[PDB]
Design a protein around this ligand. Structure first.
Ligand SMILES: O=Cc1ccccc1
Ligand SMILES: O=Cc1ccccc1
Ligand SMILES: [Cl-]
Ligand SMILES: [Cl-]
Lengths: 259, 259
């Protein structure tokens, strides 16, 4: 038996651990261990987003997960969408606990620009937010930009290739969130010694209507990865629309970082 | 075509509106309207159950749903497990808004004993709590008893016939809850003129391992229904294990109350 790995999965803003409900048993049936982190004010986390005023607070449950791992264990750390940012923040704190970072339809930040740089770049050219509701919350850390996805926007731009049941599930579980773009723009740049030292790969869906191909190529061109994997027919929510094919991708990454 | 109906679906303790993610699109594909309510401190409500101290506070979202219906609209109101108690409370308030009550693997209270009667009976009888964690919380009006299911318990007694993904999903979303036994013990009896005036039917799963088949006849003997429907092969979480058969049962019920 090839030795198996421990996958740590990190969800996107406005969602929670639940998004991995299809992928997690597939990985576990193949012998791997899986930890699906619930970030602050996400999923069933008892805080509202208004109480989570910085990206460091938002990311704390991932940092805690990594901190709690036994000596010398290393994980395959998978960041989805805004979870690319969380996993970068984590890699700058515990680089030696991460075998490889997996940027799944994710923001891939660099070590040259402020950490908000790839978000700011997408936000400028994003296309329609549809029925998404924007709001502000003033805090001792400044003003937080909040959003709550609207259902037409979800259907059209996130879930377009997902079974109707997954879309209904998401309608019942998605929450108001934030991309923390203000807090990120004033944070120290990610380090070359921490984050920059960790192996990375990028997994993209061919039909992601949120993170388009040319934008991904721009991010990778600014900050290279070791390999790129494509999931044909995937929407942005690829763990919901193509979980088997996502399994196949992760399995191929796990064989590549054997030992 | 047949006249379609508005189904209001009420989940069980420790769960939320998400449980209905397979059934809702089935009902909606057939032309019906569906509202899946989220009870207080349930699902993604960022309020802990400790803050909700009374069954009336718990049930408020359901009450609000019915109050918001336009004048003369009537619904088929479906309560699952503890949701049986919520639908009875609602029927004592708005009996004329309810075409029929559907007790789905549910507690069916009577109008003779104190409202906690059927819950107290089940707690005396039931020996399989397993790794469920029981606890108390003191309020200004007395002890409030709480529970958080354990995952071994869930698998053995609630989800044993569900796809593994549904179990994984429940593990990521279940929460500490309450059956409000003390509060319900102090409450006035349900009335004949409200709750007892409403049409009611029972839908049971043939392999319910928490609400046993005999306990169901005992409840229906204490308080009769118009009709009992049986879903063959269902576990307790029958909207997850046998959603198409549950859809069949509710479509038969809707045909029976041609509105
Ligand atoms: O990928 C996560 C996301 C969340 C809200 C809006 C757009 C994208
Ligand atoms: O059916 C709901 C339920 C909830 C918690 C424990 C046991 C049963
Ligand atoms: Cl995101
Ligand atoms: Cl229950």
């Amino acid at each position: 038996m090839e030795r198996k790995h421990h996958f740590v999965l990190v969800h996107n803003a406005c969602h929670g651990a639940w998004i991995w409900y299809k992928l997690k048993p597939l990985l576990e049936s193949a012998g791997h261990r899986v930890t699906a982190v619930e970030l602050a004010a996400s999923g069933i986390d008892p805080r509202p987003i208004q109480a989570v005023e910085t990206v460091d607070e938002y990311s704390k449950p991932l940092i805690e997960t990594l901190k709690s791992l036994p000596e010398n264990e290393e994980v395959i750390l998978v960041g989805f969408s805004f979870g690319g940012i969380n996993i970068a923040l984590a890699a700058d704190i515990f680089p030696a606990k991460i075998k490889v970072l997996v940027f799944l339809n994710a923001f891939l930040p660099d070590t040259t620009h402020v950490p908000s740089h790839v978000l700011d770049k997408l936000m400028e050219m994003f296309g329609g937010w549809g029925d998404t509701e924007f709001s502000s919350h003033e805090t001792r850390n400044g003003t937080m930009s909040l959003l709550k996805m609207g259902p037409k926007f979800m259907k059209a731009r996130l879930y377009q290739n997902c079974p109707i049941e997954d879309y209904e599930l998401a309608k019942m579980l998605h929450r108001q969130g934030s991309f923390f773009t203000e807090d990120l723009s004033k944070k120290e740049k990610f380090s070359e010694e921490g984050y920059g030292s960790v192996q990375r790969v990028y997994v993209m869906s061919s039909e992601d209507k949120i993170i388009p191909c040319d934008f991904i190529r721009w991010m990778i061109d600014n900050f290279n990865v070791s390999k790129v994997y494509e999931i044909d027919g995937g929407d942005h929510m690829v763990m919901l629309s193509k979980p088997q094919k996502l399994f196949d991708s992760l399995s191929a990454i796990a064989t590549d970082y054997m030992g």
